[PDB]
Design a binder for this molecule. Structure first.
Ligand SMILES: CCO[C@H](C(=O)N/N=C/c1cc(OC)c(Br)c(OC)c1)c1ccc(-n2cccn2)cc1
Ligand SMILES: [Mg+2]
Ligand SMILES: [Zn+2]
Length: 317
């Protein structure tokens, strides 16, 4: 009840900033997540005994892949924590609870392969869920862990609150399907400009929560250049492994995934910042002004990739 987590001074201060890196010490990541829940939500949101038992079961069900790992899960939760702290009054007690948990669980049991590779492989998960294949699996694994004995961190909620929070988490996790992002942001664009955006319209909140989920999920491109540059190695190690597996099925992979085309990566990063990341943080900034620093950080990193192309520095790779 009276038991707070406290972090060392540099973390206590830097964790409040969007560009915070959670560091290389795996064993502090659970304490960092709990610290965030306590400040974002309250010391009472979750029985600490149950939260800890949930955190460690979630950790166990992330795999040892280069990028879609436990570190990713906690990095995405931190970005969501920063958005929630900089927009104190825009979100209910249920939404704050639900979204930190959704971010921690959004990539549970990721094998390092895209929905597309599951479909071409004819993976059983692609029979069971025709669209948003991995994302439906992630929500499925989340519900599993909530139903382990002593893992129900939501048990203190009323029946109808319990249903609202699992529905917030389901939409939040489905929204991390980047195929769904393009249309979601186009609509949020139209609504903002024609002035029709209304955060009391539940279908509007859903869309806005979806964009936050894409923003948090992509937040590696909003770090200081050296974090962003080294995380790109991890991202491309999964892509190249998937490309190798495509070649094993007798399919030439897209260049992004082909390790014989590393020279094309910098232009491919420009594409990604311009087609995906910049538009994502722009629309997010328009709807939630205090998230501007994510857009500014993203612009800085696009500009660092422009320099990689012009030979004014190189990624070792
Ligand atoms: C496997 C292919 O699927 C990718 C996906 O769904 N997620 N990709 C996340 C992602 C995160 C990153 O950092 C947070 C970075 Br860097 C990064 O670099 C390329 C990628 C995908 C990649 C590129 C595009 N694209 C559309 C216009 C242009 N590109 C669309 C989808
Ligand atoms: Mg995912
Ligand atoms: Zn993710």
């Amino acid at each position: 009840g009276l038991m707070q987590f406290t972090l060392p001074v540099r973390l206590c201060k830097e964790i409040e900033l969007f560009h915070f890196d959670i560091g290389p010490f795996e064993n502090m990541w659970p304490g960092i997540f709990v610290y965030m829940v306590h400040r974002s939500c309250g010391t009472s949101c979750f029985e600490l005994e149950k939260l800890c038992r949930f955190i460690m079961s979630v950790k166990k069900n992330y795999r040892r892949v280069p990028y879609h790992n436990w570190k990713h899960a906690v990095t995405v939760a931190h970005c969501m924590y920063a958005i929630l702290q900089n927009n104190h009054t825009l979100f209910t007690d249920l939404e704050r609870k639900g979204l930190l948990i959704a971010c921690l669980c959004h990539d549970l049991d990721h094998r390092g392969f895209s929905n597309s590779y599951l479909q071409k492989f004819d993976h059983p998960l692609a029979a069971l869920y025709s669209t948003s294949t991995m994302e439906q699996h992630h929500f499925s694994q989340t519900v599993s862990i909530l139903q382990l004995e002593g893992h129900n961190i939501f048990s203190t909620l009323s029946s109808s609150e319990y249903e609202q929070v699992l529905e917030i988490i389901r939409k939040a996790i489905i929204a991390t399907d980047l195929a769904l992002y393009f249309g979601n942001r186009k609509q949020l664009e139209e609504m903002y400009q024609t002035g029709s955006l209304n955060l009391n319209n539940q279908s509007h909140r859903d869309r806005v929560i979806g964009l936050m989920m894409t923003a948090c999920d992509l937040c590696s491109v909003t770090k200081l250049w050296p974090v962003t540059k080294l995380t790109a190695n991890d991202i491309y190690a999964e892509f190249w492994a998937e490309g190798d597996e495509m070649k094993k099925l007798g399919i030439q992979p897209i260049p992004m995934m082909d390790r014989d085309k590393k020279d094309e990566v910098p232009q491919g990063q420009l594409g990604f910042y311009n087609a995906v990341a910049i538009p994502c943080y722009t629309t997010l900034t328009q709807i939630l002004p205090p998230t501007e620093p994510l857009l500014k950080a993203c612009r800085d990193n696009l500009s660092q990739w422009e320099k990689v192309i012009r030979g004014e520095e190189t990624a070792t790779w």
